[model samples]
Target chain A: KMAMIDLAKLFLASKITAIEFSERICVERRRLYGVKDLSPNILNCGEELFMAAERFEPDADRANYEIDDNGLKVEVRSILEKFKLH
Target chain B: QLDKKYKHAGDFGISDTKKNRETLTKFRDAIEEHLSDKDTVEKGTYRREKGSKVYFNPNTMNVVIIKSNGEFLSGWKINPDADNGRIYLETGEL
Candidate 1:
């Protein structure tokens, strides 16, 4: 039942950190379908926070990161619309 | 601090890369309308000085997120029966 939506809410609730949320999104993507990314040309680990981890960025950088959650809510809302392909 | 850690970035998605188009234009209009409306102002969840609003249009099944000074953050469609779906349903009655 709209698992991704709940996942998004989980992140918004701060039940999971950005890094953890990013990782979970990846896992869910893999579980949902074969592809693990939204678009090959647009390589993403579910969210930008994951990409930030690529360079070993710090959480303090996003101490006040509600903007990120705001992005997540919309992204999660789009999952069924866009990711149904793969 | 949301998650005062040094190894986390934040949730990210929605942009030119993986955008959904359904009700996009209508969503844009709705965001435009809601951004200018006082009723859409929800108390700031994380940031105190700013207003973060979530606008859900049931007809379009689209959601528009406004943050900090009526800034359009992102938007996308959700299932009619989704979790946030109920949010709009109840909030809409208002």
Candidate 2:
């Protein structure tokens, strides 16, 4: 039952911590790519985005961090579109 | 150049007997042939669209089709309901 909508809801509510969300996104990226040995460019971008999100401190104000809520939303949208999740 | 042993037997309230077993075997053979035929249509591991995987369970005689998005598409079950001895094939999307 791991759908894009569920992930979107968790992100919008900020219910999932940054670390947990990044881990979940990585897991989903693997699942979507299946057993392919070479990672696609889109998946690599997803990995980089997840790393950025992981380094971000959610407790701090959005204005102080390199990655904010809007940045995360844009990254999520790009990943979802490439994976045909939407 | 092949001789078929069992007739179509057209839904004569067949039960879990030897006769029904033969009928089911014939049905499975026909399905496999249809799936493998190339000139009639595009042939692959399954009849449905690409990006889907099909698995057959011999124990239950069931066919489970899963989409590339990790969603269940449809399934085929042999006598799923104990009360009624009927093969069930259903298709659905969510």
Candidate 3:
């Protein structure tokens, strides 16, 4: 089980294109988690991961430091801490 | 309290719920109620960009986000009674 940041590293490292990332993180989101659903929670997770990877572009460090307008913060240091927030 | 605060679609609210329709409902409403309360902690200052605002209310155990214009962006609830919840209230991070 990889963390969201692990998925993000793929995008940041340029191992995956934006479209591919969207498909896996947004369209099929939870593709990493192997889940597929349209529920708000499900969609939120997908969107968060998708954007985490998307925002990392142009500047990986900048993107991580800034919270997205959609209200997601990707720079979180601990995935374990994230598992506790919401 | 701008009516059109959030886009109809997009990556708004990366921390909402899908279970218990009513439970989710209350959480959304709770986010609304604290839009401008002085008691709420403004948590969005921790960032690189994006003008959206994040708020956390210890009294209600509510955390919410809104556009700069005051439209609903997204939100979630924390159990006020939990130690973890208290930690988030203090640190803005989990």
Candidate 4:
């Protein structure tokens, strides 16, 4: 599943260093990013992560996707295709 | 480092320039399809601190340079997937 965030603010600067998966988001929102402390920083070789949107509602899940080698490629192509000003 | 041999300047010049936009697009697409399943993406803090926080996949090497303003700069393919990490300098653009 694909996670939705304000792309205008959070820049993905690097590759997967570490990662941790979670099913529930904590109540306390940390900083302006609306991030939860429970969100683990675990980007290991094979970690399973979920992608939900709109407070985990069904309709929101429509935009959800997973992250893996192939997923990364699709995203790169999308960005390139969308903004290929050629 | 001083022991390194330095070739002539013209020796490294590009003799034949051939770039394929199609190849570039295909490579970029393959990278995205690989990483579309993470909840939260994180780069190495060590590299981040060292000012080298460009995220790239192990399989495709299609880089995702995160700018200060949070905009993602598309990556380029320095190597072809079939080459198995061998850089294809003769067939692509920089």
Candidate 5:
């Protein structure tokens, strides 16, 4: 299943005609502390969108990470360590 | 002084015909009794498929006995085939 972040990006890129609106959406989302900052991979998201349009898209494997309300984002390694409960 | 807990066993006792029928009946009755409270669930038949052996639960899983089949049958749980151990039930021929 496509993640919420991916869905948000796709919605912004396709529907919004103006660059300012898209940028504002990104900035407003980033203001929310628990919201993941997936803006850097917009280029990768564009590439995937192209590949899906050209080829048969099976499923997209997206990175899973957790963000806290305090704006603290844990790396995947640290998340795994914490899951061990040690 | 009264404290009690259920013991874990590998298999249902099918050693003798009487014990086998008793154990099967107990299992059947318990399953029916448990399902009677819910309306959406339908009562189903318990079939013994031909050429089928026994089912297993891991050491991690717990077991409960609904009937007292026998004493030796208490530990009648079968060892898993994947454990690389030979089972010699008859004639001590392992």
Candidate 6:
């Protein structure tokens, strides 16, 4: 039940791993929209995204994660938009 | 006219070096003075002007500098790592 904006802030700040970020977004998605799955068309996209984030080595370089971060951000934004949570 | 003494300096990322510590102390004191004179706009945030905002969460000892347009300029952990009373910027750069 965390605020979406706060979650995004933490993600951008790199305080939380991408996995943690995805999990929280998934939870918010369920809580706000009752969507059990992140994407019905793509099976287990949420879980996959989490796993990818988990394996992502932040020490590699922050610049490397920029693309992935933006990707996740877009997805989160889309979810919020769909639900009018923004 | 504020009789303020900061118990924690490391919380804001000020180096243990004498000069840095003194400078951070000055900044924190100024901020505290502002807080004392200002009103809380919301929860832990204090606003002295449109673009100047300070967010100090006592429970977490987290301090964030926010711009007028809501940009997070920087964040500091107060009394972290066993209350050593040091302050440093929280960054994601590896």
- DockQ: which candidate is best? 3
* TM-score (all chains, Cα) for each model: 0.32, 0.27, 0.32, 0.22, 0.14, 0.23
Query: What tens-digit string does per-residue lDDT give for candidate 4 at A1-86?
Result: 11322120121222321121111111011111223332322210001111111012223222233244344434433432343311
| Deviating ranges (above 4 Å) for candidate 6 | A34-67, A70-86, B1-94
**Candidate number of the best lDDT:** 3
Model 4 lDDT per residue over B4-83, tens place: 10101111221112224544444444435534625323333112213323444544344343435544333322222222
Ranking by lDDT: 3, 2, 6, 1, 4, 5
The deviation in Å at residue A55 for candidate 1 is: 19
Candidate 3 lDDT over residue span A15-85, tens digit each: 77554543344423323332433343333343445435434333334434544322223332232245442
Q: What is the C-alpha RMSD of each candidate to the true structure, in Å?
A: 13.2, 20.8, 10.6, 21.3, 24.6, 17.8
Over the stretch B48-87, how does candidate 3's per-residue lDDT look in tens digits? Answer: 3357667877665556765577666544445333444445
Q: Candidate 4: where are CA atoms >4 Å away?
A: A1-86, B1-18, B34-40, B45-63, B73-94
Error of 3 at B8 (Å): 16
lDDT per residue for candidate 1 within A1-86, as digits (tens), equals 23433555576567876556655554453233323333531222233322222222243354343345445545444543353412
- Tens-digit lDDT string for candidate 5 (B1-94): 0000101111222222232445555544433333233331211111111122221233321122221222111112222221111222221111
Tens digit per residue, CA lDDT, model 2, A1-86: 34334554477567875555654654453344333443344444444444345334444543233465566766666555665544
The lDDT values for all models are 0.40, 0.42, 0.44, 0.26, 0.25, 0.41
Task: List runs of model 5 lying over 4 Å from the truth.
Answer: A1-86, B1-19, B39-94
- Candidate 2 local lDDT, B3-73, one digit each (tens): 12112112112222244556666555654543344432321122333566655543434444455775544
Clashing pairs in model 1, backbone N/Cα/C closer than 3 A: A48-B12, A49-B10, A58-B6, A59-B6
| Residue A53 of model 2, lDDT score | 51
lDDT of 5 at A13: 41
TM-score of candidate 6 relative to the true fold: 0.23
lDDT of 5 at A81: 34
Structure candidate 5, residue pairs in collision: B10-B77, B11-B77
Worst 10 contiguous positions by lDDT, candidate 6 chain B: B1-10
Clashing pairs in 2: none
**Is 1 or 2 the stronger prediction by lDDT?**
2
- Cα lDDT tens digits for candidate 6, A1-86: 33545565577667876656754644442333323433432223332333233223323343332345556656545544553444
